[PDB]
Amino acid sequence: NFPEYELPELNTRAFHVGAFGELWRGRLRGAGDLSLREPPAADSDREDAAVARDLDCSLEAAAELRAVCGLDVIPENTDLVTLGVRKRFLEHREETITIDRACRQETFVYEMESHAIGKKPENSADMIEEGELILSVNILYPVIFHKHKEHKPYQTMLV
DNA sequence: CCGTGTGTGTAAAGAGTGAGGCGTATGAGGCTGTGTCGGGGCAGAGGTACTTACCTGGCAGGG
């Protein structure tokens, strides 16, 4: 069913997860990203033909769309708003801490986040199929420290 | 040249107060009634200069 909200940013109405996955899979059949294959002059012609077919334009139109819409390092200058605050934070930290080395608690949550993403199965027979509906549940750690009533710790699992 | 002895980041506890919203409880209002008791008037004992008049002390005689 629909994931329709129940509250503005805290809840939604109870919905069947299977029907939700089915709706997503149906509305993405044959025109969806459900391939799960990593990215790789002859192919340019095929791409132009596909663009022409999908957008109802000529081959020359597809070629010029491809050409014009083409894709278009630390120090900065010529500031903007957010680049301004970034540069200021960086210079402040420069007059600040002498050991730039990344904190051991940021690296922890980072590595836990990217522990095993982008690691394909070595069997390739149990690999999940398309539309497998990952639910990112987070289990609340039990209250085993006083500080765990205040800010409720939790561990996230990709069920 | 590899031991070790001290520093440092930065969010993680550890308290340490403090704050805010919400939900339940309370109240106030006539109403009407009935026992009662402090109460609150209620009056009540009960305790500036000059002049004239009057009083006092004294010494005097009298008997």
Task: Name the one residue in this structure whose structure tokens are 């957008």.
Answer: A55
Distances from the Cα of A12 to the Cα of A4, A7, A141, angstroms? 6, 6, 23
Task: Name the one residue in this structure whose structure tokens are 């289990």.
Answer: A139
Q: Which residues pair with A140 in a beta bridge?
A: A154
| Resolution (Å) of this entry | 3.0
Task: Name the one residue in this structure whose structure tokens are 């394909």.
Answer: A120
CA angle centred on A74, ends A73 and A80, rounded to 5° = 100
Is any atom of strand B within 7 angstroms of residue A13's beta carbon? no
Largest CA distance in chain A: 68
Which residue has the least CA–C1' distance to nucleotide B10? A103
Spatial distance between the Cα atoms of A121 and A18, rounded to a whole number of angstroms: 25
With contact defined as beta carbons under 8 Å apart, do A59 and A49 qualify? yes
Q: Which two tokens stand for residue A144?
A: 């085993």
Spatial distance between the Cα atoms of A50 and A35, rounded to a whole number of angstroms: 18
Strand B nucleotides, any atom under 7 Å from protein beta carbons: they are 7-15
* Nearest nt to the A145 alpha carbon by C1': B13
- Tell me which residues from 94 to 113 on chain A have a beta carbon below 7 angstroms from nucleic acid strand B: 96-99, 103-106
Q: Which two tokens stand for residue A150?
A: 């205040």
Closest CA to A21 of A117, A96, A109, A133: A133
From the CA of A22 to the C1' of B62: give the distance in Å.
163
From the CA of A108 to the C1' of B60: give the distance in Å.
140
From the CA of A68 to the C1' of B56: give the distance in Å.
145
From the CA of A95 to the C1' of B3: give the distance in Å.
34
Alpha helices (runs of H) in A3-150, residue ranges in sequence order: 17-26, 42-55, 59-68, 81-95, 104-113, 147-150
Q: Which two tokens stand for residue A67?
A: 């050409």
* Nearest nt to the A105 alpha carbon by C1': B11
Q: Which residues precede chain breaks (C–N over 2.5 Å) in chain A? A: 40, 72
Spatial distance between the Cα atoms of A35 and A78, rounded to a whole number of angstroms: 42
Spatial distance between the Cα atoms of A34 and A132, rounded to a whole number of angstroms: 10
